[PDB]
Amino acid sequence: ADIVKVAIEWPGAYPKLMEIDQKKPLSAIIKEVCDGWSLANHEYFALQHADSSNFYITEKNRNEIKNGTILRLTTSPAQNAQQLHERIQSSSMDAKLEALKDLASLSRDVTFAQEFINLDGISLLTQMVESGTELDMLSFTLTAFVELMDHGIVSWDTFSVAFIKKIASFVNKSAIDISILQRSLAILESMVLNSHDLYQKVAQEITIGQLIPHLQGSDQEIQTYTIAVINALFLKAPDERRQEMANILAQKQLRSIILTHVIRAQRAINNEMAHQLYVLQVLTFNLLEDRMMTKMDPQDQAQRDIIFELRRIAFDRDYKKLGFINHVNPAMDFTQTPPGMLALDNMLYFAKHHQDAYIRIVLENSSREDKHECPFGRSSIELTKMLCEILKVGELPSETCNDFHPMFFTHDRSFEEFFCICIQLLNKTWKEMRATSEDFNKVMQVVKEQVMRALTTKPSSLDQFKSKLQNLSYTEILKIRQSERMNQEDFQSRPILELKEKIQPEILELIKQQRLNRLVEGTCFRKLNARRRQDKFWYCRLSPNHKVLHYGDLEESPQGEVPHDSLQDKLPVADIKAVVTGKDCPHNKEVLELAFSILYDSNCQLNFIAPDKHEYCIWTDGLNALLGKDMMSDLTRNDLDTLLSMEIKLRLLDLENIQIPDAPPPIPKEPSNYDFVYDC
Amino acid sequence: MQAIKCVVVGDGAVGKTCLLISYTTNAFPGEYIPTVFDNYSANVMVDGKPVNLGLWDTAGQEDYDRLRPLSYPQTDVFLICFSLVSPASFENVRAKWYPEVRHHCPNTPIILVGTKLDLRDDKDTIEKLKEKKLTPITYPQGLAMAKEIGAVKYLECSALTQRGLKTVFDEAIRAVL
């Protein structure tokens, strides 16, 4: 039942074509194959792929075997691990090289790496790196090492301190062979990730001025693994020492170095380096969470002195002109976290580094005794809070995100600089709003809708961020987005398009009553060869009963209509066979597009030339009506759409700000009880 | 009500008898009692030509090439009949009553009509108009024909339908016009 067609090969023999039954154990299959090849000791053998990297097959992986694959019987994973443990330690350098190569090739397989770790080949490679002399061999050694340890069969804590110091020397010495550095950085990153004691041992063996210059290499993989070791030491670092590590990194210009040699480098940023810049970003933002959640002590005289100095720099009530809710004890306005102490750090930065903007924004609202003043204190509090919200201060890095704001890399204090920029834009929007203290929160939302709409443009530096903010309006771009989110979802959403077809025919008939009126009225026309005072123009009309016509003639006139009755008047209407258009009139190419003939009792017909494409729609469509046919012109369809726009408009007046379910919700089971307690 | 000397020439395959007899008995599309002695007649308060017509039917047969010649010399107009299921009608037209017009008068309104207009084109009239391999004549063959020998209008009417009837009777009256 569960069969897979396979060919099994062996050097020096012909392939055996087997219809492997997936219920039979692998051992029976290998025994059958060895018996067909007259090979004794079938238990010494297993099966692998003859194709690409040739993972050995286990009772689990055999399910991935596709039909027609070529497979090679070979030594068992245990036998491969044994021959590799023997040959990778051989005194012959060529044999050891080939063994290390084949081992780095086959170490990606979990079933072989099981056997290889179970013989402490990890220790063989460890000793080879620790005591190898004149150290290609080391590259395959370390590659096999990482492929072996990536399978989680033994703990990383089994590594001796000698190996840790050896790999730390390889990453710590002057630039060495590229592959050796890649593998050493990978081992270092992994051992920091899997063990805290290993991170302790690694942090003392490598310095910042060593992890930084590996970013100076032109190979982007070196850069990825270097910043990977950086972020590993950062994630495994204690919370108290994390700030000191960040200061030590900023002192060596880590930010500007990554700016000059990564984000503005010649090589484009790959996915993994984007992930690594993302985690470095989220941790650098996390460095502020500690100050985000700490409340001020209102009894601490130094913390109140900071408020007093921040008032003195501005003014030179007692706090009402600075904008705090608590006029006498503003420290209370800081006991709420978020933002708490981050708000104060930000506003003291705005006063010390951006003193001009600070004094401008405070003196523009310190003497306003009308209700239009912008309270700087409460605004800065809520603004540090909302910026902690939009950036998600305090979030842990994950594996799925690769995004970063490159702007932060242009300035050492781009966080507080951006704080100053957004308080400037806050008071700008406040003055543009004519808003009051009661409309505070609304304003904040606007500013949020402001900032959240700028970061999406990915500004390269803080000035581009400012320019984007200058471009944003309230809520004009949001109004455009709201008007655009409906035009797309009108037709491209089945839940909105479903009623577009139930009433659509009745919408056409609503048009068609107007077309019946336009039929009863009757309009002018044009007679062919109507030269020499013959009536070129000639009007029309029809009875209310839709069963008798009534039309007359006209002349070329400067003033207008002359409703003079002609002898061509009563043609009862139920007789109309069909109305043809264009060339099918029995008799300047433009008039032929306007030429169309009524066709009724066999040889009795009449030709027409409508006054315009408007009436060319009107007449042919009303004649489709007199015979019940659908309307053919696309102007009638334009009227159809102009209608169904307002007709779904009346309906969206009922489902505003509610997510339109494109997947229809299911009908629940019926109420088995039909005893309505409330009546009809 | 002014009556008129109406002598209705027209060949034997035409059948204007039933024609008149179904119009002016004034009953239905179809059923009217036909008649034998057939100077027929009809009218309307027609057009301020509020007039009656006295249809002078001789025998429609050929034994009258005097008695019919004794119906010509001063007939106001002549109803001159042919048909469509048999092109011989579309030919006798310049051929028989038309000479006979040339023959008694070169002055009066003289016109033509293909009867069997409603009969020209049955799959069975189509069918035995092909078996005889002549044509369920095009009225177009008409519009030439009537440009040709003198149909001052040219028409058709059928009393089964009781139709084309006034249409015919139209200027069959307003020949005055």
Residue numbers in the entry:
A (entry chain B): 5 to 139, 153 to 333, 354 to 624, 634 to 726
B (entry chain C): 1 to 177
Question: Anything the authors wrote about it?
Answer:
We then analysed the structure of the DOCK2−ELMO1−RAC1 complex by single particle cryo-EM. Refinement of the combined particles resulted in an EM density map with an overall resolution of 4.1 Å. The ternary DOCK2−ELMO1−RAC1 dimeric complex adopts an elongated “S”-like shape with pseudo twofold symmetry, measuring 320 Å and 65 Å in the longest and shortest dimensions, respectively. In the ternary DOCK2−ELMO1−RAC1 complex (open-conformation), ELMO1 adopts an elongated, gently curved shape. In addition, our structure suggests that ELMO1PH is directly involved in DOCK2 GEF activity by interacting simultaneously with DOCK2DHR2 and nucleotide-free RAC1, thereby stabilizing DOCK2DHR2–RAC1 interactions.
The evolutionary distinct and smaller family of DOCK proteins activates CDC42 and RAC to control cell migration, morphogenesis and phagocytosis, and have been implicated as important components of tumour cell movement and invasion. The binary DOCK2−ELMO1 complex adopts a closed, auto-inhibited conformation, whereas in the DOCK2−ELMO1−RAC1 ternary complex, DOCK2−ELMO1 adopts an open, active conformation through a conformational change of the ELMO1 subunit. Our study suggests a model for how upstream regulators control DOCK2 activation through a conformational change of ELMO1, thereby relieving autoinhibition.
